[PDB]
């Protein structure tokens, strides 16, 4: 007669690592890394992301005519943009402080677009003729929808003196621009006056832009350049334009409504018709693992990202062979 102390074995095949030994076989184990996504872009908590397709944030905000999809967008969860979106800045140039604006967009969930200076508000200048081959729409030459390319009326560009007061309760993103022609004859052809300027004023802004003449390579068949600036007009604050040419003038501005945490993710992917609680640039995540290894940039209720290939905790004991 005999009594024995002993312990559990089973038919487990699960292995875990220790400092002193690798692939120890254990009775029980708890894998804590999520390794699987669904490879789609999904709604986040029911809320759909703004998917720019071939449009850049710039293409969207200025209203490139090929970006008609995003003329009026509902509230979004997060924004997706490609690495190299084609429909950006159709008339070539720059967007001043673009990245800082993109940064601001990351704390924004809804813009409501409103008209601040009506296109048919211009008495002394031509406003229907500010178009280009670089921004085609339905075959014909067209321009960014949100800004007005002002031109001389019957050979005269009189000084413009326009003001807009923010009666809204929401911060206003206000967008404008300046045109840099290639030579003096272009300057005369559109605006007449040889030297011009645009001054922009607000409580905090003290701006004066001046056209930069240079001969340059045709980007998109144009050698001219548009350079776009912006400001956040506070409530009860007035923006003051004054200019004698080259002025690209606001028609529409964006009310900032319902700003909430959000991000712009970079992804060649397209919308997936799904819902998720945690999204990544490569796909969405559904898991209760404390960690995942999918991609560092997530948004939502997400597990923590690590660069591991494997994280498995022993819970049972060493399984005998």
């Amino acid at each position: 007669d005999q009594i024995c102390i002993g312990y559990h074995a089973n038919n487990s095949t699960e292995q875990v690592d220790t400092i002193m030994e690798k692939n120890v076989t254990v009775t029980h184990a708890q894998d804590i890394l999520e390794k699987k996504h669904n490879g789609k872009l999904c709604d986040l908590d029911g809320v759909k992301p703004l998917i720019l397709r071939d449009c850049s944030v710039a293409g969207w905000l200025l209203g490139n005519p090929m970006c008609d999809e995003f003329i009026n967008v509902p509230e979004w969860s997060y924004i997706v943009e490609k690495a190299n979106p084609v429909n950006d800045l159709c008339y070539p140039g720059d967007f001043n402080d673009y990245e800082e604006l993109k940064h601001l967009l990351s704390r924004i969930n809804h813009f409501e677009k409103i008209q601040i200076i009506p296109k048919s508000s211009w008495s002394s200048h031509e406003a229907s003729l500010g178009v280009s081959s670089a921004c085609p729409y339905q075959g014909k030459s067209s321009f960014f929808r949100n800004v007005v390319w002002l031109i001389k009326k019957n050979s005269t560009y009189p000084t413009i003196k326009r003001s807009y007061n923010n009666t809204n309760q929401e911060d206003l993103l206000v967008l404008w621009g300046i045109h840099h022609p290639n030579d003096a004859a272009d300057q005369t052809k559109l605006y007449q006056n040889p030297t011009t300027y645009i001054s922009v004023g607000t409580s905090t802004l003290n701006q004066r832009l001046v056209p930069r003449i240079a001969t340059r390579s045709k980007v998109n068949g144009q050698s001219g350049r548009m350079e776009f600036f912006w400001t956040i007009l506070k409530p009860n604050d007035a923006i003051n334009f004054e200019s004698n040419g080259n002025f690209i003038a606001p028609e529409y501005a964006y009310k900032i409504v319902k700003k909430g945490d959000s991000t712009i993710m970079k992804s060649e992917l397209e919308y997936g018709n799904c819902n998720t609680k945690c999204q990544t640039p490569m796909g969405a995540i559904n898991s209760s693992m404390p960690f995942h290894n999918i991609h560092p940039l997530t948004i939502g209720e997400c597990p923590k990202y690590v660069k591991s290939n494997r994280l498995v905790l022993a819970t049972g004991l060493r399984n005998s062979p």
Partner: protein
């Protein structure tokens, strides 16, 4: 293992004990079988559950990459931004992998420790009555009736 029991003087585990993690095998005239030691098993289950949750918990404070873009003439701050985001990921990857490695080894040792302790608890009861065979088993001087229930009991002699 540090405690010498598991895959030590006790050569291997038991497929026949599906009952819990540690216990007894008895064998006498009336037959033979396995019974799990409820107390040490339950102590062990709590130890490990708590550990796991502690491990998960300490790991939720952790770096969260935020996307940021930089123009063509900000290559230095973009590189700064990159090396910072990667650095915190390397630090947390290292943290999690090591913690796992170290705590796995403490987990296997803890089970080994629980087996030895349970063994000793039985050694301390049978002290001259049975012969300590050397393999996890004690062989009785006097035949033991299903007396066994009493070794498992904590109440023997």
């Amino acid at each position: 293992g540090l405690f010498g029991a598991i895959a030590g003087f006790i050569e291997g585990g038991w497929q026949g004990m599906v009952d819990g993690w540690y216990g007894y095998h008895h064998s006498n005239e009336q037959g033979s079988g396995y019974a799990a030691d409820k107390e040490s098993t339950q102590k062990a289950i709590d130890g490990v559950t708590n550990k796991v949750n502690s491990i998960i918990d300490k790991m939720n404070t952790q770096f969260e990459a935020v996307g940021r873009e930089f123009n063509n003439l900000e290559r230095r701050i973009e590189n700064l931004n990159k090396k910072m985001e990667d650095g915190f990921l390397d630090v947390w990857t290292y943290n999690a992998e090591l913690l796992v490695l170290m705590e796995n080894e403490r987990t296997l040792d803890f089970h080994d420790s629980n087996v030895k302790n349970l063994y000793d608890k039985v050694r301390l009861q049978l002290r001259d009555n049975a012969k300590e065979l050397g393999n996890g088993c004690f062989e009785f001087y006097h035949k033991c009736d299903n007396c066994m229930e009493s070794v498992r009991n904590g109440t023997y002699d």
